[PDB]
Design a protein around this ligand. Structure first.
Ligand code: SRN
Ligand code: ZN
Lengths: 883, 115, 96, 195
DNA sequence: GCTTGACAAAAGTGTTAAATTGTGCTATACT
């Protein structure tokens, strides 16, 4: 609604949305634009504000001068894509008698992010106090950046004071007195290492959107406050021991010039809602009594928050307190805050699917949230498309201008999630400004599509969907509905070393021609090649010192005439348990000038992609906090199927015990079937009493129609059952679901029907980042740490499991002294033990007696270093030492 | 010069989140023994012992001394010829024939796997 | 390395005890040469005291094979033994 | 209360002189290693910088003693030497702890000994072990109470040494090395050997 | 079956020329 190319999604809203959702990406842009002092901010502030606004840097010099004025900012060095490729920082140098260059100044992208050393970072706004809730200030990105500059400038003046005294007068200039090192090093020290500077969490467009807008609460204390209404979302916060500290901004929240959050309010006068929406900060909120969103307004015109308590001005709409992620949970008013918080967190944990299907039963934020995330292509100017190709799209605006958009194709995200843009328009299509041209990763036709719509049955199925487990139809594997691409990045470097310079070459010391069969002439894996666990990606060789080889090896050298090569082998193989195809290779050489850290000669990185079928063990979840692994996947044949023969996709047990409820899930399941089969109230002699509250538009709806039930203002119980009554039959006209949302399913194995009618429907489930391929670990032998000889998780893999202190307690409880000793010695710290055990295992001999764990030996050394003379006394052997 | 200027980092630092593990814990000890190799190496010594049996008594000793399999230190042709009391060229001739005998398929096919 | 010891006792380590433990006084606050990257002599990491870096290899190299063990190189002063001793041997510092 | 400390020295043989050190032991290098990190950078323990402060101040003291310097300078050095050994043993126990770049307190021998994740409590008690693995769990309603479902790949790498010997006893692979690659590449002939 | 004298390469060894490295020093007055 109100968007040009918005798809048709009917809404059950009984209240109009008076104010359009603000650009929910503004919290980051306004602060940085105020910082740099862009003309757009001056033009926007001057119109309705002070006529002499001062930019963040302009204000910093104003207070610092006299000891500097008129700072300059040249155009950006390289483009965002060019920065992420070359691993450089998206910055624009700034300048300031003697002219001075202060340093490369980082810049904020259109998505409200920064490129610091080739990575896309996001600065989190901090909420600090300027006691009471309203006393919170909330530093915006631009402001807390300026404060870091203050430290740089001030300590820069501390250096100039010392320099001018020792230096001869008139023999010094601003360039000689100014050592900007603490200034440039202050900003570089912020965007990196700083706790508020974070890598943008982007496995789905919503995750990155909520990463921005998210704020810190501290600069009891975790509990929500009445003031947080319409400002900070109380339903969104980490589950870990950080609850309350972290919170995402509300939908309509707007920040004032200082940083004090403002909330949209429509002042109510004489019992009639006034369209005048004004900013009322936390303090200004108590001045006028605030009315409740859901209010009985009859036709044209027509429980409130007290100044300091609970139960003048009217709310702009519901969900003011709710955030974007929270506002996307259908039937939010029914789920408990715990599951709602869980639901929001898991929504941003979804992964982009190859197909990306939009939710059949959704709310309202999908469209707005997608286009505002920045991961969807929007048309800047109304016009018509000139060319539509998988690579780019061009639009011939009526104005005559000519804009083009290059599409991200199989671009690896920050955590290996593939971001692929799809064009949704054709050649002759006439598109309006602000319309959607291409779909992002988790979007379809402009609205977020974080999951898929599946046929569900809520019956316990022979214990395979037990507790929180789930069973899926093999169709989800055959039809690639839950298949998601995952890209991995590997890197290797060739630099100068102590005794030689590394050389990445194809020739490997001891290898067969088959293992090198898939390498190119330089030694890097050829594009499009399939790589299994252990295969070589890049062949690197580094100098090895004095060989001093073993004679038993030299003899075979002469026998087979293989000259003992000069240096050692250092090839980059694929990590254990990984596999896929090679997408691209990036080679950065030294002969080719380029720009690599001192000593580095050549730098190449290989990108490997994987098409992950939805596998048993993966973690699925809905928008209501319900989560569970895939316990089994039956063939489509033996699966509870409707009378149509239409098998169900997933079988979910009744997780919600009484009181626990999880009611919201049941509602969208029924609506899911309604939206999938359409309906028709069959109005005869009026319309039923339940549809009276309904607006005309939802009376008749075809099959597969998408529905929107905004959080608090959504479909209601009565209206539901009515839609249950109306259900268009399938081919042949048989009915599959009754007014109770149940159906008689046939057990695909026995062939006999299930005695009782089972609840079936369509629920929107998500595929979460927790994946089996990434979490399965096994280790027989592997690398060991240097300091402590304990099994170390090699960077390839093979990391050993930790046998913590508590597990030892359980082992002692059983009385299994030998198993415990085995774990803490030959399986870990026994330098000569683990080798003789492996030896004994291969021969088939008895396992030898454990030795002394290296940890204990290190302990005695630590004691002696502390001047504690410890002696392991024998019963009759006096002193003893390890050695 | 820019390589010399770089200063070291602290192993006792905490790269893992919330002190989960210090940086030093992730350092491999590449010099540590490899169990599988110490066994293969032991099997290789045993397999060469048999191969040495096929050669002449003196011929097997020459191969040992030339590569130092017995005492761990190789010997030049003169030194090897000094223990057998012959010219250093004679030892060169004898050794070459040993290698030819060693490259025979019967004696050599078994050791290819040991690369 | 019998794995069966009856007792385990502590006690204040005297200056003599410390001197007896040590394999030589570390005289310099040096670690490794910034170029060769090898342990500096008389300082921390000094192979002459703590132990060699490579198995049965002295610092200079006049002794490299496993043939001779338990001896010390008359040039660099490094005992030819396993590199593990680098983890069992201690030094000491005589305080002024 | 004081008699306990006095009687302890009498009932034992420890000379109370041990409380004042004339020589300081130096921990082996491998326990305070300095290795070059992956990526060309160097890493080293804090003990090396703590020993350095001690050996530096100690040497400077010999210099001052031999230079016949005033007692203010010499005494100032002994005080500095005293504090360097204190930092080496239990840094921070007295006064502000010695901090390196970034203002972080250096890890002394005391901290190295103890700590939740330190070598005293659980780093010594709780250690990592070979022949292990993990993965997400799923219900196994058809299993017997004494049974468990193990992913083939996990059971393979877990029993790798075992299957290696079996498929060598059987004339599938001719030597150990031949059996290793046979398991690593997951040739279909091992599965029957695995069960 | 082994040795000879040629010849060469490789390994040393003594003699020198860079270069690397350690120490001393800088005088308005300065606490
Ligand atoms: C705990 C914390 C940050 C953690 C690293 C992540 C927050 C964990 C909460 C949770 O996800 O449940 C606090 O962060 C700031 C200052 C103090 C705290 O730092 C702390 O106490 C600890 C670390 C603070 C900054 C660390 C920066 C660098 O450490 C790594 C690299 C650098 O950035 C970090 C990236 C963080 C992005 C996270 O984003 C979240 C999901 C994942 O937890 C991460 C992808 C998204 O859900 C996103 O919407 C949530 C962002 C958290 C907003 C908090 C701002 C205050 C990454 C872990
Ligand atoms: Zn030597």
């Amino acid at each position: 609604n109100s968007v040009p190319g918005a798809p048709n999604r009917v809404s059950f809203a009984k209240l109009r949305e008076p104010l359009e959702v603000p650009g929910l990406l503004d919290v980051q842009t306004d602060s940085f634009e105020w910082l740099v002092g862009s003309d757009r901010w001056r033009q926007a502030a001057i119109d309705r504000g002070e006529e002499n606004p001062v930019g963040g840097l302009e204000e910093v010099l104003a207070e610092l001068s006299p000891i500097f004025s008129d700072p300059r900012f040249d155009e950006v060095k390289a483009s965002v894509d060019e920065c992420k490729d070359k691993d450089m920082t998206y910055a624009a140098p700034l300048f300031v008698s003697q002219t001075v260059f202060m340093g490369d100044f980082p810049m904020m992208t259109e998505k409200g992010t920064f490129i610091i050393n080739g990575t896309e970072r996001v600065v989190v706004s901090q909420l600090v106090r300027s006691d009471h809730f309203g006393n919170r200030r909330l530093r915006t990105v631009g402001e807390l950046i300026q404060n870091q500059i203050r430290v740089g400038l001030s300590r820069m003046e501390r250096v100039v004071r010392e320099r001018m005294t020792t230096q001869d007068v008139e023999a010094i200039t601003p360039q000689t007195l100014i050592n900007i090192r603490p200034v440039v090093a202050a900003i570089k020290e912020f965007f990196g290492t700083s706790q508020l500077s974070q890598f943008m969490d982007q496995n789905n467009p919503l995750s990155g959107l909520t990463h921005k807008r998210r704020l810190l609460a501290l600069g009891e204390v975790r509990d929500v406050h009445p003031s947080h209404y319409g400002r900070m979302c109380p339903i969104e916060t980490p589950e870990g021991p950080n609850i309350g500290l972290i919170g995402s901004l509300s939908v309509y929240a707007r920040v004032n010039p200082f940083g004090f959050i403002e909330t949209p309010y429509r002042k109510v006068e004489n019992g009639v809602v006034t369209d005048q929406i004004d900013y009322l900060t936390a303090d200004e909120e108590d001045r006028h009594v605030v009315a409740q969103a859901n209010s009985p307004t009859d036709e044209n015109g027509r429980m409130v928050r007290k100044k300091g308590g609970e139960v003048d001005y009217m709310d702009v709409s519901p969900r003011q307190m709710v955030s974007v992620a929270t506002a996307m949970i259908p039937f939010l008013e029914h789920d408990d805050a715990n599951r709602a918080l869980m639901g929001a967190n898991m929504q941003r944990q979804a992964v982009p699917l190859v197909r990306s299907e939009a939710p059949l039963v959704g709310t309202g934020m999908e469209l707005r949230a997608a286009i505002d995330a920045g991961d969807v292509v929007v048309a800047d100017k109304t016009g018509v498309i000139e060319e539509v190709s998988a690579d780019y799209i061009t639009v011939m605006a009526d104005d005559g201008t000519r804009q083009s958009y290059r599409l991200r194709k199989f671009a690896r995200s920050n955590h290996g999630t593939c971001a692929n843009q799809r064009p949704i328009v054709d050649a002759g299509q006439r598109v309006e400004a602000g319309q959607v041209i291409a779909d992002g990763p988790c979007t379809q036709n402009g609205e977020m599509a974080l999951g898929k719509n599946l046929l569900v049955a809520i019956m316990p199925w022979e214990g395979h969907n037990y507790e929180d487990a789930i069973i899926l139809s093999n169709r989800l594997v055959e039809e690639d509905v839950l298949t998601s691409i995952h890209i991995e990045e590997h890197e290797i470097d060739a630099r100068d070393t102590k005794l030689g310079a590394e050389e990445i070459t194809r020739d490997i010391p001891n290898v067969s021609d088959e293992v090198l069969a898939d390498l190119d002439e330089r030694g890097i894996v050829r594009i499009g090649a399939e790589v299994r666990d252990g295969d070589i990606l890049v062949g690197k060789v580094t100098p090895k010192g004095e060989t001093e080889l073993t004679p038993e090896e030299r003899l075979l050298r002469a026998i087979f005439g293989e000259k003992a090569r000069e240096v050692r082998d250092t090839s980059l193989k694929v990590p254990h348990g990984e596999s896929g195809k090679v997408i691209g290779i990036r080679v950065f050489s030294r002969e080719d000038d380029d720009e690599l850290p001192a000593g580095v000669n050549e730098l190449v990185r290989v990108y490997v992609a994987q098409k992950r079928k939805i596998s048993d063990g993966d973690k699925l979840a809905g928008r209501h906090g319900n989560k569970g692994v895939i316990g089994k996947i039956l063939p489509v044949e033996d699966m509870p199927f409707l009378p149509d023969g239409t098998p169900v996709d997933i079988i979910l047990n009744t997780h919600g015990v009484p009181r626990r409820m999880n009611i919201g899930q049941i509602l969208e399941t029924h609506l899911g079937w309604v939206a999938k089969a359409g309906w028709n109230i069959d109005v005869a002699a009026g319309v039923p009493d339940w549809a009276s509250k309904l607006p005309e538009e939802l009376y008749s709806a075809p099959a597969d129609s998408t529905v929107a039930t905004p959080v608090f203002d959504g479909a209601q119980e009565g209206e539901l059952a009515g839609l249950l009554g109306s259900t268009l039959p399938n081919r042949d006209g048989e009915v599959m679901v009754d007014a109770d949302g149940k159906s008689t399913l046939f057990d695909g194995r026995s062939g006999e029907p299930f005695p009782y009618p089972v609840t079936v429907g369509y629920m929107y489930i998500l595929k979460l980042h927790h994946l089996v391929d990434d979490k399965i670990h096994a280790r027989s032998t592997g690398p060991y740490s240097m300091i402590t000889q304990q099994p170390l998780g090699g960077k390839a893999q093979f990391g050993g499991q930790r046998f913590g202190e508590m597990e030892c307690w359980a082992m002692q409880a059983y009385g299994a002294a030998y198993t415990l000793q085995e774990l803490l010695t030959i399986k870990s710290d026994d330098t000569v033990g683990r080798v003789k055990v492996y030896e004994a295992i291969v021969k088939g001999e008895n396992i030898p007696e454990p030795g002394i764990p290296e940890s204990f030996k290190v302990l005695l050394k630590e004691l002696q270093s502390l001047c504690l003379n410890v002696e392991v006394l024998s019963s009759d052997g006096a002193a003893i030492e390890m050695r | 010069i820019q390589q010399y200027a770089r200063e070291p980092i602290s192993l006792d630092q905490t790269i893992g989140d919330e002190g989960d593990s210090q940086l030093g814990d992730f350092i491999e000890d590449s010099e540590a023994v490899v169990a599988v190799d110490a066994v293969s190496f032991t099997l290789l010594q045993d397999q060469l012992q048999s191969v040495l049996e096929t050669l002449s008594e003196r011929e097997a000793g020459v191969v040992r001394l030339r590569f130092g399999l017995t005492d761990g230190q190789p010997r030049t042709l003169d030194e090897i010829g000094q223990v057998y009391g012959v010219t250093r060229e004679r030892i060169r001739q004898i050794e070459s024939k040993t290698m030819s005998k060693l490259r025979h398929p019967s004696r050599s096919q078994v050791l290819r796997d040991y690369l | 390395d019998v794995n069966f010891f009856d007792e385990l006792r502590i006690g204040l380590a005297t200056a003599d005890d410390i001197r007896n433990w040590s394999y030589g006084e570390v005289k310099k606050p040096e670690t490794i040469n910034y170029r060769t990257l090898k342990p500096e002599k008389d300082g921390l990491f000094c192979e002459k005291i703590f132990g060699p870096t490579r198995d049965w290899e002295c610092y200079c190299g006049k002794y490299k094979r496993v043939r001779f063990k338990g001896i010390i190189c008359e040039r660099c002063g490094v005992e030819v033994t396993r590199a593990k001793v680098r983890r069992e041997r201690m030094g000491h510092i005589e305080l002024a | 209360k004081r008699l306990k400390v006095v009687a302890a020295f009498q009932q034992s043989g420890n000379s109370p002189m041990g409380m004042v050190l004339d020589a300081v032991p130096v921990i082996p290098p491998e326990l305070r290693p300095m290795v070059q990190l992956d990526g060309g950078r160097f890493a080293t323990s804090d003990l090396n910088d703590l020993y350095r402060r001690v050996i530096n101040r100690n040497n400077r003291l010999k210099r001052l003693i031999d230079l016949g310097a005033p007692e203010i300078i010499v005494n100032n050095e002994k005080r500095m030497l005293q504090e360097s050994v204190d930092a080496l043993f239990d840094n921070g126990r007295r006064g502000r702890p010695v901090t390196g770049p970034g203002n972080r307190p250096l890890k002394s021998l005391s901290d190295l000994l103890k700590g939740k994740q330190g070598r005293f409590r659980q780093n010594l008690l709780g250690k990592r072990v070979d022949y292990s693995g993990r993965s997400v769990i799923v219900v196994g309603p058809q299993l017997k109470l004494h049974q468990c479902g193990l992913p083939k790949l996990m059971a393979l790498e877990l029993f790798k040494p075992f299957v290696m010997k079996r498929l060598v006893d059987l004339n599938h692979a001719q030597n150990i090395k031949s059996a290793k690659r046979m398991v690593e590449r997951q040739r279909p002939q091992v599965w029957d050997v695995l069960e």
